[PDB]
Amino acid sequence: GLIYAVGGYDGNTHLNSVEAYDPERNEWSLVAPLSTRRSGVGVAVLNGLIYAVGGYDGNTHLNSVEAYDPERNEWSLVAPLSTRRSGVGVAVLNGLIYAVGGYDGNTHLNSVEAYDPERNEWSLVAPLSTRRSGVGVAVLNGLIYAVGGYDGNTHLNSVEAYDPERNEWSLVAPLSTRRSGVGVAVLNGLIYAVGGYDGNTHLNSVEAYDPERNEWSLVAPLSTRRSGVGVAVLNGLIYAVGGYDGNTHLNSVEAYDPERNEWSLVAPLSTRRSGVGVAVL
């Protein structure tokens, strides 16, 4: 019942701090810091732990992974990725965490690795058809979707879906707008692609994917343009946390109510954060 904002970049420093949002109090509070500063970090939740995967510490692209236990309020290192990855998308499906794409400092990645907590190890799985850093990843009805990103030359509107039973990625409907640094979350059978950057403009637009129709449709726009935004879903609302509007790194947070199809501002973060990972536990 808390949203965690993990790491990021405030415009001057890559962050190891972590803040947690309680919707009942509408406030953010600091919790235990990461061992390593991480922007462009992927974050996901599995079996009561939050995993902070990869990122960039200001000097090095990271292969390390840390796990947060809320009962102990501490982060511990777990198995490292095979490949350093910042701008990596992370999602959880059927007891595995998937690290999708990213950038290793030299190359934009099409590779994908899966973490099994029982074995505490990462294994490579099927690669994406297109290299993607700054990719948004979400899970819906047994498929993992890799949304947008940047392949080193082009900001992407394409979207691919992974079926673990087939261990393969297949293209699905493209976004209306190219988006890297896009936040993605799932609510009530739709995938939302929030903000991002199209190569020329930081975006306030938001699009929603219906798998039954295999199409994206525009929904209400954010009040503030946000790339490098973290997105998570809690109790029927989607939260867009931080990001960068082209001029300023943001501490603001907005919440989307699908019944009203509108975004409203909620409590701000204590620290401006773009390239922030967000998860709910």
Residue 267: partners with Cβ closer than 8 Å, 6 or more residues away: 21, 26, 27, 28, 253
Phi, psi for 258 (deg, rounded to 5): -65, -25
Burial 91-100 (b: 16+ CB within 10 A, else e): bbbeebbbbb
In angstroms, what is the resolution? 1.3
Q: Is the dihedral of CA 174, 279, 125, 197 positive or negative?
A: positive
C-alpha–C-alpha distance, residues 111 and 104, integer Å: 11
> Which amino acid is it at 204?
N
User: Residue 181 in contact with residue 227, Cβ under 8 Å?
Assistant: yes
Which residue shows structure tokens 């970049």? 9
CA nearest 225: which of 254, 200, 196?
A: 196
Dig out the tokens for 86 from the structure.
């910042």
Distance set, CA 130 to CA 10, 114, 154, 182, 218 (Å): 30, 18, 11, 16, 24
Which letter does DSSP use for residue 56 in this model?
Answer: B
CA nearest 112: which of 68, 184, 163?
A: 163
Residue 119: partners with Cβ closer than 8 Å, 6 or more residues away: none
Q: Is 215 exposed, middle or buried (0-12, 13-18, 19+ CB in 10 A)?
A: middle
Q: Is 87 left (phi over 0), alpha (psi -120 to 50) or beta?
A: left
Strand pairing partners for 219? none
> Which amino acid is it at 202?
H
Tell me the HSE value of 128 on the side-chain side, using a 13 A CA sphere. Answer: 32
Count other C-beta atoms under 10 Å from residue 141's C-beta.
8
User: Residue 48 in contact with residue 94, Cβ under 8 Å?
Assistant: no
Dig out the tokens for 270 from the structure.
């204590």
C-alpha–C-alpha distance, residues 32 and 29, integer Å: 10
CA nearest 190: which of 238, 229, 152?
A: 238
Which letter does DSSP use for residue 133 in this model?
Answer: B
The percent helix, strand, coil of the chain (3-state, each to 5) is 0, 45, 55
C-alpha–C-alpha distance, residues 257 and 182, integer Å: 19
Tell me the HSE value of 239 on the side-chain side, using a 13 A CA sphere. Answer: 28
Which residue shows structure tokens 């190891």? 16
Indicate the SS3 state at residue 103: strand
Residue 260: partners with Cβ closer than 8 Å, 6 or more residues away: none
Euclidean distance between the first and the last CA atom of the chain, given in angstroms as a whole number? 6
Which residue shows structure tokens 């199209």? 198
Which residue shows structure tokens 């490579």? 124
Residue 90: partners with Cβ closer than 8 Å, 6 or more residues away: 42, 43, 44, 51, 53, 97, 98, 99, 100, 137, 277
Which letter does DSSP use for residue 44 in this model?
Answer: E
136-140, strands of its sheet edge to edge: 136-140, 143-147, 159-163, 168-171
> In the PDB record, what is the listed experimental method?
X-ray
Please, what are the domains in the chain?
3-280 (2.120.10.80)
User: Residue 54 in contact with residue 38, Cβ under 8 Å?
Assistant: yes
Which residue shows structure tokens 């995993």? 51
